[PDB]
Structures are given as structure tokens and as C-alpha cells.
Amino acid sequence: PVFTVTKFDKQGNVTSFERKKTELYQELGLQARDLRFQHVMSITVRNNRIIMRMEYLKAVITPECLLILDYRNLNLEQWLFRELPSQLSGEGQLVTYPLPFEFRAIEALLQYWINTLQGKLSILQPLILETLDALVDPKHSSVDRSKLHILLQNGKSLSELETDIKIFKESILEILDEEELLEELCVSKWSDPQVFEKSSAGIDHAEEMELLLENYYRLADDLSNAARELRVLIDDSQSIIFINLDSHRNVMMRLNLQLTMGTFSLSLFGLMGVAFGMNLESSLEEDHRIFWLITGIMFMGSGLIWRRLLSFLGRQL
Amino acid sequence: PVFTVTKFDKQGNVTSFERKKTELYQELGLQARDLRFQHVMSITVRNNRIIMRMEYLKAVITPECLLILDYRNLNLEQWLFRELPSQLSGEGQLVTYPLPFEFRAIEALLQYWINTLQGKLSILQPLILETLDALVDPKHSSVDRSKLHILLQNGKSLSELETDIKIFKESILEILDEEELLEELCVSKWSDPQVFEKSSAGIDHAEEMELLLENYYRLADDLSNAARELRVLIDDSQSIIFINLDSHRNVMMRLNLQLTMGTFSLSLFGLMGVAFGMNLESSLEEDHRIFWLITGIMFMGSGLIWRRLLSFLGRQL
Amino acid sequence: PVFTVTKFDKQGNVTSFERKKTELYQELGLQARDLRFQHVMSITVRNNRIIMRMEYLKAVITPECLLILDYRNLNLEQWLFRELPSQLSGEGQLVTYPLPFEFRAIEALLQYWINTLQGKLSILQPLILETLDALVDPKHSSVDRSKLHILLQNGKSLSELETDIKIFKESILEILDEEELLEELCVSKWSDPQVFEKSSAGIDHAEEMELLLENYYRLADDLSNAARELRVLIDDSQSIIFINLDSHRNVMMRLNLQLTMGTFSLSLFGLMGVAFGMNLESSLEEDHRIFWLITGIMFMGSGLIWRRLLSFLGRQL
Amino acid sequence: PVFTVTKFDKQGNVTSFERKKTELYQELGLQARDLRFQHVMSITVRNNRIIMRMEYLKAVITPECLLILDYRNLNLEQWLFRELPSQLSGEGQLVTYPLPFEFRAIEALLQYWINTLQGKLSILQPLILETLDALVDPKHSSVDRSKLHILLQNGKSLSELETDIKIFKESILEILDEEELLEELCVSKWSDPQVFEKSSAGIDHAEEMELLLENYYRLADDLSNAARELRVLIDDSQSIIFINLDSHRNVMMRLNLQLTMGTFSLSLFGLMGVAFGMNLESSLEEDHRIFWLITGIMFMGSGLIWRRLLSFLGRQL
Amino acid sequence: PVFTVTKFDKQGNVTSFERKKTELYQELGLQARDLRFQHVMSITVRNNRIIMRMEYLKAVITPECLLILDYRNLNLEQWLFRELPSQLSGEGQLVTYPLPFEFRAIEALLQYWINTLQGKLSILQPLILETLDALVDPKHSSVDRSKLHILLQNGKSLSELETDIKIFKESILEILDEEELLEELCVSKWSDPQVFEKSSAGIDHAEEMELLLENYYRLADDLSNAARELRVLIDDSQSIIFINLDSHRNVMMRLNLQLTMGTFSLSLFGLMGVAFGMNLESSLEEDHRIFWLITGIMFMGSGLIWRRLLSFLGRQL
Ligand SMILES: [Mg+2]
Ligand SMILES: [Mg+2]
Ligand SMILES: [Mg+2]
Ligand SMILES: [Mg+2]
Ligand SMILES: [Mg+2]
Ligand SMILES: [Mg+2]
Ligand SMILES: [Mg+2]
Ligand SMILES: [Mg+2]
Ligand SMILES: [Mg+2]
Ligand SMILES: [Mg+2]
Ligand SMILES: [Mg+2]
Ligand SMILES: [Mg+2]
Ligand SMILES: [Mg+2]
Ligand SMILES: [Mg+2]
């Protein structure tokens, strides 16, 4: 096929072209299996070439140049053509530390990925915090139906972000743990064992590579703790939501039971009113002191039975 | 008994026959304990023979041939006779890497198992996603009864798939961790310490075996993260289902309580209508301005008591 | 006190007797602290003697004999007198592998314990599967009261079985990890450094002991995964049970609310029927076109209010 | 200040006195930072002195004596003056193993703490088992209100006990893992490099110290599994309690809905009875075959509507 | 920019000033990347300087002085100017241990952070305990709405505190695990390899640094267990809250069902009273022994049906 290559030289100059994969393997001195890019996160060195893939960002770091592959249709235009050249050129920062190009390229790629991981968390966190805050207030019998889908979607994005940080840390820690892997990153040292050793002023050794990789492992470790705390907060907030729903359930069920007692009291003493309303000879239809006596009994009796019933639920706490 | 053997030579030729287990041990130079195949996942080397079992796939890799055992009644016909010979023959790919037959056979077997593990996840994931998506919508008082059995069955298949990936990774990592185990896989090297060493051009050494095994450990590690995220999503979606069920429970319980208040108001003020309907002398049956006054009181009184009761639940939030 | 000893010689002959603990220490060349048997799972070697305890099975493996202690009232009669002698005698299997008696005794004891652990799971699994299957069907408002106690008891037995497998694996892995511990198991080698070394044909070395112990670690590892999946299935099934109970709760609560609306509609429009049934002058008792008009209003009005109320809950989704 | 010291010599003699902390540091050859006792669990050796703290038990093991500090108001009277002297004196047990005083003192202190940890579990376990057993029976609509506080308190004590076992195991495993730490416990060896080496009969070496410490690590490991299983059982029992509560909730809700259907049927067909009871001209008050016809319709119609409604919930499963 | 520096010399004298970052790098012999302070918890040594950050506390420990950076608007006035000088001066404590300034500065900084971590837990624990205690009492149908927000906020602060302790332990354990990292803390040793070695009386070696760092790892380990137990107690208490809410839900639902049975009984037998109240010829309006017979049937029949219905729910347990 073809690889859309954006090539940065040691001076930060940007050249973009297109080359066949078969010809690129010979030009880079690699094989077809080296540039398969079939791992979502991987930082490997194959024949003096640093091959890194971070999700959509596939790059190869050569002794003298940095190549970005498959840079189209991925919003890799502002960083690639305006921010990346400045970092690779070495301008500013410190002029007393002329580190090799591999250190500048590895730092630029690692910094870029830690920025997208940080940016993803800086967007998820306000969304989850604002959705959980209004879902957890104990002032409603129910919850917002639409905002539960937001929490479900944002929780899924949080778990995918947690994996992205986790596999970023594993890739860096794999190189840090093994000294041979860490030494392989010093690409210019092996390309020129004599020219690079001439400037033996501590420009790049095992310490400088370890310091660079440990810096981004700790930055990603900060992301892991912040993303893990957010996931813990989601679980804690949902448990408070469950107590809120089941507490107002009991409040409405107590009011319903109190009103049920009142309707039973009226029905119990309204039965004698219904009984005395039948069109049968009650032998009392002529008395003038029976209607008001029964009417008083029904109203007072309903009140007394209601008061007695209300103490029944109070007895049941 | 007998072993149904499908034998592939160094040229990919397929020969199928049947041999007694006792005779196969002598032919292979093995013992009865070596070919017990009592472990669901195992990759061991016994006397210059690579013995691998992956669930139903049992294979022995010899210096010059690959044997597949118990290949019947397992749908091992398309891969065995059409896809496996092409991979073992070495055609295509790279003609500049004449790797030994053991590397080709190990890669073909490891690739096949990572494809079935990937295929199992590629089927479970859409089924779980589509069942969870329609179970979680907050537009129904209840959930689909039949689709809960689908989620239960698919969740069980997901946990069995998670174990299959987990024990696949452990088997590969066991060989990767120990250099002696990794060196044992170089079967042709030990069979011919001089003939194999003649082609000392980096065809097969500790790096090539490590690169092959690390490739499939990372492919299975990708499967572990994808299957673990799916299990996390199931738990997150069920918690949202619980909030949905308990929120509409509170909505229906609030409507029921509001209607209960209305029926109590009618019953409370309908008692005086029942009282005035008895066949007793009320001393008011002749007045012409008492019927409409009481009728108005009952209807207005029911409304006022209902309005007062509705504020009672509003006071209870 | 006394130890009920069942002694098996190198030929598998069974002798049972009773000896005092104090005399047994001198006969075995051990101490009182060595045979305390105070650990539920332990495989230790003390002065050229392999001392193993597996729950109720306490055994000491000597250079020339195997002793089983406290074999009474534990159903250790079929295995001890019919199955164990055959395995220790070395008959069958392979006649070309004259392994020492310690290998035969360790294998027989380890095989026996992996069989009881497998048998315990082969009984728990059908019981849990059949109880969960009928508890999870979404065709009942509630669950079987009696079968919840079965699940509680079987879940407790599953967790105790999980610990039995876990501590069995730890005991084997402790010996496997340390080469000195693994070498101590070669009891006959240290008893006869010259006689055993005479048959230097690979009968028993570090590989044969490691292969035997790794075989039973992997068999127990299979048990751990099967028992862990069952525990995961219990948790998954209970969550589906909770959704089933809370979905039929909402179905019955929706039917109750729909019938509550119908009774309120009848009560609301039955109040005018009660109002017109009082024994007061309504100034309409003589008209012939008022009774049927009011009766129609009550029945039609109840229907219209019921239809309007039914749309109210539909508005609330 | 002052330290309340209970001193045991090599013969088990008990002497109790009080000494200032400043003078005790010089007498013991220690510093103020060594005897801070600010760690709840700690077993450290500082200048040939074994300093151990186990919650309230603070002890210093010297070459020739064992000192217990802060032994007042802690029920340390029966063990200190009646049980501890017997163990330290070396009487009974084995007279052929004249182990140094440090081994006897370490064993006595470690045995005492494993007894209090075992005793705490032997009290919690029956309390939790008896509370869970009667809370889980499916014969009550609710649970015992008072016994939920017992489970909450006993669960809190179980988690504190789990930490006590966990940090006891970590303290022992720290010494076991490092050989230098294990060698420091041989206090008499370093105090008298020549006198102790004279009795080179295996009285105390790296094996005897390792055997003593591994014995109590495994005893505490047994406690960890028993306490962990109890915590798992609490969680399993509570989930069964939730199913019990939500199953009888559905049973009472089905009975209430069935009775609600019956009251609606009476109200629906009682409306025509109320309609025919108004004091309006119905044009049917003179017929003799209308009263019983309507009365039959109301009673039969209520039954038919009730039967039809009962099938409605049966349709909803 | 500028760094607000509070400088403490070897005598504890406090000097506060303001210096530009660029000039401070040259004065301290460091680089811009060394003082980035972009890690929430970090204890690193860069060119004979101990650089530590603990949340808001950023400090650099030099051979002869301790510098605190960004000390404004953080309540760092009482500790900085009244408590810190006393600890750094070396007054009191022990005059026989003239440890270097780095040991005094590291101890003062580590002690300060363990005090703020302890103080945060000493505030959270009473707040959570008092909120959980009154939320868990089984004497209310519901829970306090306002106190659920307190538990949610305090649970979030507890999880952030748990991370603060966790990363404090990781930072200390990283130095403890690696001897080279631990040796780098001995700043005065490398600054003066001969002057420091002159006082070879055990003032500061690998043991003294290890003892200081292990002391604060164990103090933070105590905090981890106390904060972890509190989080476990929150989860246990919430599960008891759920049982309390669902038990009183069943109690109120049983009372409501018992009263529903009573109202159905009155409605069932009140239908014959309504039937006999219609203005139709019942052919019984003249009999004198029919009114009281029907009235008795309605009242007795309601009681008998109610008693029969009450046994129905008793049959359903
Ligand atoms: Mg992801
Ligand atoms: Mg490698
Ligand atoms: Mg499986
Ligand atoms: Mg091996
Ligand atoms: Mg109700
Ligand atoms: Mg009613
Ligand atoms: Mg057990
Ligand atoms: Mg050992
Ligand atoms: Mg009337
Ligand atoms: Mg504790
Ligand atoms: Mg140490
Ligand atoms: Mg934090
Ligand atoms: Mg380092
Ligand atoms: Mg519930």
C-alpha cells in the first residue's frame, strides 16, 4: 500500500510525502513485521529504530529524523506543523543541554500523549461531577431520566481512559525495569559509537533516559489516581442515591398508610350509616334523638379509631 | 486406544491417519505421561518435542513435522486443510527469513488460538452491548423479562472467555520469564547442534523466539482489556437499571399517594352525605336551603382538604 | 497417647497397628514438634522424612515405607486398603521408570487430595447451577423461600472449597519456588548418597520431582478457575434476580395505580349520587328527566376522568 | 517518666519494679528512639536487644532476661505470673533441646499473641454465625431491628481483627524474607561469639529460628483464612436477606393488588346501586322485578369483573 | 519569575527573601527541570540536593541549609517560624547523636507531613463515625436527608486522604528498596568525602537513613490501615441501612395490606346495604325482622371475612 509520512529532520523542518510500504522498509532498514502497528500501546526498538504507537499516533524515530505515519483524518495538523517543530528544533528551554535527537523526539511524543490523556480527564471530570452533584440531592422522589444516560456514557469513557493510562504506564515501566531496553533507546550512541562518545559531557546516558521516562511514568501515575478517585466517587454517589430513593419511598409509604387508616376508619363507621339508609323498617325512623346520636358516633368513632390506628404504626416504629 | 493424527511435514503436505497411542509414544520418542493432555492450557517441551494443548486443539511439534491430535468432530477442517498448509509452507510473507519449522508451527498454532479468542469476543460484545442498551433506557417501568436471560447467559460466556485469555497469557508468560524454557522451544537447534549452527545468520535465536511469544502475549493482553471493560460496563449498566427501576417506583408511588389523598377527601366529606341519607328524622328534611348547602360543603370541602393534603407531601419533599 | 498407624512398605503391603507417640518419634527419628500436625495444609521435610497433612489425612513418607496416621472414623478404608496398595506397588503404568518410593508415595497422596477437591466441586457445581437456574426465571413475583437456604449453604461450602484449593496450591508452589525445598523431597538420595547414585539413569532428579509437583499445581489451578467462575456466576445470577424482583414490583405497582385511578373516578362521580340520595328537599325529586341525566353523567364522567388519569401516568412514562 | 518492668531471668523468676526511662536506656544499652513503642505491631532488633510490641504488650528480650513494659491495667497477671514463668523455665517439653533464652522468650511472646488473636476469632465467629442464621430465615416480612446493630458491631470487630492478623503476618514475614534480620534474632550468638559456638550441636541456628517464625506465620495464616471466610459469609448472607425482603415485598404487593381488584369491582357495580338510591324519580320504583334483577347484576357483575381482573395480573406473569 | 524562599541554616536561623528562578538555579547548582515541582509527591536527589514536594510543601535540602519554596498563603507560619527552627537546631532530644543537617531536615519534613496526614484522619474519623451512627439506628422509616450529603463529602475526603497516604508510602518505599537511592540522601557524605568520614563514629550511615525512612513508612502504614478500616465501615454501615429501610418498608406494607383487607370486607358486605338502600320495591320494606338481620350479617360478615383474609397473609408467611 502506502504510508502517509510526515518527516521531521534534526532542525525541525517538516516534509510530508507518500511512500510505498515495501520501499519504506528498505529505506528505514526494517521489516514488514516491525511496522505492523497491531498493538494499541507499544514502544519497541527494532534495529536502531524507535517504533512507537499510541492509539492513532504511529511514529518511527531514526538517528537523524522523526517520521509520523497515518497522520491524516486525525486532527494531527496543529500539533504536527506548529507545535512539534518548535520542540524538535531545540529552541528555547536550555541551550547548555545539547541532547541527541532521539531524546527530543521521545520527549515530544511522550509529552503529546500525556496531554491528550490529561485533556480527556479534564473533560470527563467536570461532566461526571456536575451530573453526580444534581443526581444526589435529596429533594426529589426520583432522578432525572435523561442524566442517567449521561452518567452511563461518561462512566464508560472513564473506564476506557483508565485503560489508556494503565497501558501507557506499563509500556514505560517495561523499558524502565530492563536496563537493556533502556539502553536500546540511545539510538545515536549505537549508530555512532565513536562520534557520540566524543561529546562525553553527560549529554545522554542511562540517567538522562531514565529521568525522562520516569517523569512521564509519574505524570501518568498522577492521572491514574485522579481517574481512580473519580470512579470511586461514582460508586459512592450511587449508593447515596439508593438511600435517597429508598428513604423517600418510606416517607410516601408512611403517608399512604396514615391516609389508609383514615379511610378505613370512615368506612368502618360509615357502614352503620349505610345500614341505617336501607329502605327497611328499622323501628327507629320516628325518634327525634337517634339521627344526631348516630351521626355523632360515626364522626367521633372515626376519629377515635384513626387515633388508635396511628399509634399502631408508632408502636411498629 | 488410537490417536487421529493429522501430520504436516516441512512442506505443508497434509497426511491423515490413525495410530495406536502405545506405538505413537515410541514413534515420537515420548512417554504416556507426556501426551496425557489433562491441562486445558499448556505449552511444554518434552524431549525435543513441543507439546501444546489449547482447549480442544492438541498438537505436537517435532523437528520436521507438526501433528494435530483429536481433530475430528471439532470443525477443524477448513483451518487444517486449507489455511494451515499455507502458513506452514512458508509461501509469501518474507522469503529472506528462512525460520525453522518450529517457529512456523508455533506461530500458526498461537495465531489460530488468538483468532478464536478474538472471534469469541467479537460475537459476545455486540450481543451484550445491544442487550444492555435497550435494558437501560429510562422509558419503561420494568425491563424485558426474556432479555435478562440473554444477559445472564452472555455474562457467563464472557467470564469463561476471560479465563481462556487469562490462562493463555500465563502459559506464554511462563516461557517468556524463564530463559531455559524459551531456549527449549528451539527444537531444531538441539536436534542438530551443528547443522543448525551452520546457518548462523540470525534465523532463529533467543530474540526471534521472544519476539514471537511477546507478540501473542500482547495480542492476548489487548483481549484481556477489552473483555474486562465489557464486564465493567455490565456492572455499570445494571446499577443504572436499578436507579431507573427505583425512580419510576417513586413516581408511581407519588401518583398513587396523590390519588389516595383525593379519595380520602371524598370519603371524609362523603360521610356527612351518608349520614344525611339515613331513614331517620333529621329535623331538616323540610328545609329548602339545606340540601344545596350541604352538597356545596361536601364538594368544596373535598377540594380544600385535597389541596391541604397535597401540600403535606410537598412539605415532606 | 497413641497413633493409629497404617504402614505401607515398598511392595504395597498393608500393616495396621498402634504405637505410642513417644516411641514413634524415636522409631521415625523425629521430634514431638515435627508431628504436631497443627497446620491444615503443610508439606514439610524434617530429617529425611516427608511430613504431609491434608485436612484429615496425615502421612509420613520414610525412605522405605509410607505411614498414614489417624485413619479411623474418616472413611479411609476403600482408598487405604484397595486403591493405595496398587499405586504404591508400581504395577502397571510404566515398567521402564523405576522411580523411588518417595515419588510413588508423594504422587499417591497428591493424587488423592486432588480427587477429593475435584469431587467436592463436582458435587457443588450441579447443586448451585440447578438452584440458580430456577431462581432466575422471570416468571414469578417472588423466589422459592426454601431454595435460598440451599444457595446460602452451597455458597458457604464453595468458599471453604476455594480456600482448600488455594492453600493446596500455596503448599506446592512453596516447594517449587525453592530448589532446596524441592531437593529435600528426594529422600532416598540423601539416605543413600552412593546406592541411589549408582542407578544414574534419570530415575529421580530435580526434573522428575518438579514435573510431578507442577502437574498437581496445574490440576489445582484448573480447580481454582472452575470454582472462581462458579462464585462469579452466583453474583451475576443474584443481580439478575434483583432486576426480576424490582421489575415485577413495578408491573404490579402500575396495575395497582391504574385500578386506583378507576376507583377514584367512581368515588369522585359517586359523590353526586350520594349527595342526591340524602333525605333532604333537593327541589328536583319530581322531575322525570333528572335521574337518568345524573346517572349518565356519573357513568360517563367516571370513564372520562379515568381516561384522563390513565394518560397522566403515560405522561410520566 | 517511669517504666513498670516485669523482669524474667533465664530461670523464669519473676521480679517486678519501676525504673526511670532515662536510666533504663543506659541499663539496657539502648536509646530513647529505640523504646518509643509507636508502632502497633513491630519486631525489631536494636543493639543485641529484641524489641517487640503487640498492641498493648511491649517487651524487650535481652541475652539473659525478658522484660515486659506497661503491664498494668491490661489483665496481664494470670499469663505473666503463672503461665509465662513455666514456658521460660524450659521445664517439660523436651530436655534434649537446650535452646537459648531468646528462642524461649520469642516463642512465648509469639504464642501469647496467636492465642489472643485465636481467642478473638473464637468469640466473634459464634456471635456472627448465630446472628446471621436467624436474620436469614425466610419466614418474616422484616428483620430483627436490634440484631442489625449486633451484626454491625461484630462486623467492625472482625475487620479490626483482620488487620491485627494481617500486620502480625507482615512483621514475621519481614524477618523471614531477610536473612540478616533473621540472624539478628540470634542475640546470644552475637553476645558470646565463642561461648555460644562451643555448644555447636545445632541448638540454635538459621533453621531453628526460621522454623519457629514460620510456625507462627502459618498459624496466623490459618487465622486469616478463617476470618476472611467469615467476612465473605456476612456478604453472602446479606444478599440472601435482600432477596428475602424483596420476595415477601412482592408477595404482599400481589395480595394487595388482588384485593384492590375486588374493591374496584364492588365500587364499579356499587355505583348503579348508589345511582338507584337517589331521591329522584327513576320511573322504576313501582316495578316488582327490578330490585332483585339489579341486586343480582351488582353481585354477579362484581364477581365476573373480579375474575377478569385476576387474569389480567396472570397475563402480566 | 520569583521563588519565595524561607532559608534555614545549620543553626535553625530563619531568613526569608525572594529570588528569581533563573538565579536560584545557579545558586543551588540545579537546572530548570529539577525544580519544576510537577509531581504531587516526590522525593528525589539531584546533584547533591534533596528535592522534596508534599502537596503544597516544596523544599530543597542543601548540605548546609534547608529552603522552603512557595510558603505564602498556605498557613505555613506557625510551623515554619516557631516549630521548624527548634527541630533543625538540634536542641534537646539527644546530644550524643550529632547527625548531619540532612538527617535533621529530612526528619522534620517527613514528620510534618505525617502530622498533617494524621490530623486529616483525626478529623474525618469522628465526623464519619457520628454520621454513620445516627444514620444506622433502626428507629426511623427513612434517613436524615441533610446528613447523606455529609457522608458523601466526608467519603470523598477519605478517598483523597487514602491516596495521599498511598503515594507517601510509595515515595519512601522507592528510596528504601534501592540502596543507591538511599545512599544519595547522605548529601554531606558526598559533598565532603573526607571531612564527613573523619567523624566515623556511626553518626550517619546506611542504617541511620534506613531507620529514619522505615519509621515514617510504618507510621504511614498505620494511617493506611486506619483509613482503610473507616472505608470498610462505611460500606458495612450502608448495607445495614439498606436492610433497615427494606425492613420497615415490609412492616408498613404488611399493615397497609391488613387494613386493605378490612376495607375490602366492609365494601363486600356494604354492597348489600347499598343494594337495600335503592328506591325500588324490595318486597321486604314492611317486615320488622329483616333490617336488624341484615345489619347483623353485614357487621358479622365483615368480621369473619376479615379474619379469613388475615389468615391468608399468614399462610403466605
Ligand atoms: Mg481503552
Ligand atoms: Mg527483550
Ligand atoms: Mg473457561
Ligand atoms: Mg522447569
Ligand atoms: Mg398501595
Ligand atoms: Mg378505597
Ligand atoms: Mg476451608
Ligand atoms: Mg526453609
Ligand atoms: Mg335513601
Ligand atoms: Mg485493628
Ligand atoms: Mg534493615
Ligand atoms: Mg488526593
Ligand atoms: Mg534511579
Ligand atoms: Mg430495593
Numbering used by the authors:
A (entry chain E), B (entry chain A), C (entry chain B), D (entry chain C), E (entry chain D): 84 to 400
Please quote the authors directly.
Most of the Mg2+ influx into mitochondria is mediated by the Mitochondrial RNA Splicing 2 (MRS2) channel, located in the inner mitochondrial membrane.
Four Mg2+ ions (termed Mg2+−1, 2, 3, 4) were identified along the pore and two (termed Mg2+−5, 6) were found in between neighboring soluble domains in the MRS2-Mg2+ structures. Mg2+-1 interacts with a ring of backbone carbonyl oxygens of G360 and amine group of N362 with a distance of 3.8 Å and 4.3 Å, respectively, indicating that the Mg2+-1 is in hydrated form. Two additional Mg2+ ions (Mg2+-5 and Mg2+-6) have been identified in the interface of neighboring subunits between their soluble N-terminal domains termed soluble sites 1 and 2. Mg2+-5 in site 1 interacts with side chains of T246, D247, E138, carboxyl oxygen of E243, and E312 from the neighboring subunit. When overlaying the HsMRS2 structure to the archaeal MjCorA X-ray structure, in which 28 Mg2+ ions were modeled into the soluble domain in an asymmetric manner, the Mg2+ (atom spec: MgE406) between subunit E and A of MjCorA is close to soluble site 1 in MRS2; however, it is coordinated by E155, Y186, T90 and Q62, which is different to the groups of negatively charged residues (E138, E243, D247, E312) in MRS2. Interestingly, adjacent to soluble site 2 of HsMRS2, a salt bridge is observed between R116 from one subunit and E291 from the neighboring subunit, with a distance of 2.7–2.8 Å.
